[PDB]
A paper describes a structure:
[name] is expressed on the T-cell surface as dimers in two isoforms, the [name]αα homodimer and the [name]αβ heterodimer; both consist of an extracellular immunoglobulin variable (IgV) domain, a stalk region, a transmembrane domain and a cytoplasmic tail. All of them are [name]αα homodimers, and each [name]α exhibited a typical IgV architecture consisting of two anti-parallel sheets.
Among these three structures, cCD8αα is a special one that exhibits unique characteristics. The buried surface areas (BSAs) of cCD8αα, sCD8αα, bCD8αα, mouse [name]αα (mCD8αα), rhesus macaque [name]αα (rCD8αα) and human [name]αα (hCD8αα) are 828.3 Å2, 979.6 Å2, 928.7 Å2, 1048.7 Å2, 1105.5 Å2 and 1026.3 Å2, respectively, indicating that they are tightly binding dimers. Especially for chicken, the four conserved aromatic residues contribute 161 VDW and 262.21 Å2 BSA, which account for 42% and 34% of the total VDW and BSA, respectively. VDW and BSA provided by conserved residues in cCD8αα account were greater than 42% and 33%, respectively, which were higher than those of sCD8αα and bCD8αα; these results indicated these conserved residues may be the initial key elements of [name] dimerization.
Author numbering:
A (entry chain A), B (entry chain A): 8 to 119
């Protein structure tokens, strides 16, 4: 089943000012996934969609493309937060959209 | 901006055993929306995608199609829970997917 996790499964919380790598492991390859961040608010934010070919699409109002990197690394999807700051905290999820049905990963809490 | 709300804005909580109607008001028409439910868990569930033509697509493992009705009613999207039961409680959101970018509504808490 679908999970979003820290690349470093040993860490419990992200470090302020460090690069943060998350991994999404999708039940299906050759379907892309979207990374999203949920505030403690509950408020939901789209970060990036990664195609099976590692093509990325970011939101239009754009700090995002400069603060996050998306890629597919052999069967799994990756999201990198270049410098993890306070405004990046939240619960991160992977979403796959296959035949107009959505599939959600388990979330990864990322709070100092 | 995008909001999911009770059709009856006067009510604070859904009634056990009553039909529940929610409304999604999308920044864009002639794009469909997906309804999702989030547990208190944080766990996310796809309910249904409604096309701009009121065409519905439900999950494959299917209690869902029999317990929820989706439609577009003049500019807004509607989700009906036929008989609202304990297992239907959660925070409901609308999602639009336009050019591989996702847009999320504010959520509507639905708990007794």
């Amino acid at each position: 089943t679908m999970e979003a996790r820290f690349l470093n499964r040993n860490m419990k919380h992200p470090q302020e000012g460090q690069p943060l790598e998350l991994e999404c492991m999708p039940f299906n390859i050759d379907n892309g996934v979207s990374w999203i961040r949920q505030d403690k608010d509950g408020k939901l934010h789209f970060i990036v969609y990664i195609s099976p070919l590692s093509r990325t699409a970011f939101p239009r109002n754009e700090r995002t493309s400069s603060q996050f990197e998306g890629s597919k690394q052999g069967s799994s999807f990756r999201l990198v937060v270049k410098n993890f700051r306070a405004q990046d905290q939240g619960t991160y999820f992977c979403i796959a959209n296959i035949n107009q049905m959505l599939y959600f990963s388990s979330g990864q809490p990322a709070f100092f």
